[PDB]
Structures are given as C-alpha cells and as structure tokens.
Amino acid sequence: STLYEKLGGTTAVDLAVDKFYERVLQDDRIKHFFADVDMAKQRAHQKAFLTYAFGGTDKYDGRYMREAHKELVENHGLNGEHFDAVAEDLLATLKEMGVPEDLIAEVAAVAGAPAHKRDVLNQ
Ligand code: HEM
Ligand SMILES: [C-]#N
C-alpha cells in the first residue's frame, strides 16, 4: 500500500492540505510568504503535489520546486527556518487529524528530504 493509501487517500490529503494552510496563515514565521498567493490555486496544487509525493500518482502536473520557490528565495529571504516551519506545520496538522505517529514519520521523511529542501531553497 502507498503512503497516500495508508493516510486515507484523496479525502485525507484534501483535508490535510486545507488544514495545513489554515495553520500556515496563522504562523507568524511564514504567513506573509502567501500575502499575494491565490490560495484556491495553491490548495489545488499542494493536493496534487502531495498525492504524487505520497505515491498516489506517477507525476506532479505543475512546477518544479526550485522554479516554484525561486522568487521567494531571491526577493523575500526564504531560508532554512521558514522551511522547518512549513515541515513542522504539516506534521502538526497530521497529528491533529489523528494520523498515527508511524505515518507522520513517513511524511516527515518526504518533507525533509535534501532533494526537496535544496530545490525549494534554491541551494
Ligand atoms: C516542502 C515540504 C514544500 C513543498 C512540497 C512545497 C510545495 C509547493 C507547491 C506544489 C507549490 C505550487 C507549485 C506550482 O506552481 O505548481 C508551492 C508554491 C509555493 N510555496 Fe511551497 N513547498 C514547500 C516548501 C515551501 C516553503 C518552506 C515555503 C515558504 C515558507 C513555501 C511557500 C510557497 C509559496 C509562497 C508558493 C506560491 C509561490 C508563488 O507563486 O508566489 N513552500 N509550494
Ligand atoms: C508551499 N506550500
């Protein structure tokens, strides 16, 4: 079974993403990164992205992480602390939803992979 399946599939990811952005927009460390972001579009992209990242689809139909975050790194000071805030907010949301610790851990390994971090932070 994939991580996607174990978590509860579409409706679990849909709920997690919605809740995650609720948490992010209240997080003073990072909420301002989304000041000019269309959150309907962002929600749909993240649902599609995590579906892919958790093995629910072969591919992500959307931007690469490096190009996606480039303007944030170059113009708005996006750094490792913001990255860690995002990972922490995602995992907090899953804990709150009742996702078991062993699955929360598999998600942490995805969100924290160097191939993700280096591209997002354009390092
Ligand atoms: C790290 C765990 C991480 C992921 C995964 C991620 C995903 C992601 C997607 C799928 C998009 C949309 C891309 C597309 O256009 O197809 C996107 C866009 C933005 N992100 Fe992100 N992102 C991750 C990490 C971070 C971090 C650490 C921040 C800032 C705190 C952040 C922020 C943003 C913002 C803002 C956007 C929209 C960019 C824009 O167009 O202005 N992401 N992310
Ligand atoms: C990016 N969220």
Swiss-Prot record:
Named cofactor requirement(s): heme
Alphabetically ordered keywords of this record: Heme, Iron, Metal-binding, Oxygen transport, Transport
Annotated phenotype, changing H45A: Changes iron coordination
Stored InterPro entries: Globin-like_sf (IPR009050), Globin/Proto (IPR012292), Globin_bac-like_CS (IPR019795), Hemoglobin_trunc (IPR001486), Hemoglobin_trunc_I (IPR016339)
Pfam families found in the cross-reference section: Bac_globin
Recorded superkingdom: Bacteria
A single cellular component GO annotation: cytoplasm
GO molecular function terms attached to this record: heme binding; metal ion binding; oxygen binding; oxygen carrier activity; thioredoxin peroxidase activity
Binding locations of heme: H45, H69, H116
Cofactor note: Binds 1 heme group per subunit.
GO biological process: cell redox homeostasis; cellular response to oxidative stress
Function: Forms a very stable complex with oxygen. The oxygen dissociation rate is 0.011 sec(-1).
Quaternary structure annotation from Swiss-Prot or TrEMBL: Monomer.
Protein family according to the UniProt entry: Belongs to the truncated hemoglobin family. Group I subfamily.
Protein name: Group 1 truncated hemoglobin GlbN
Underlying gene: glbN
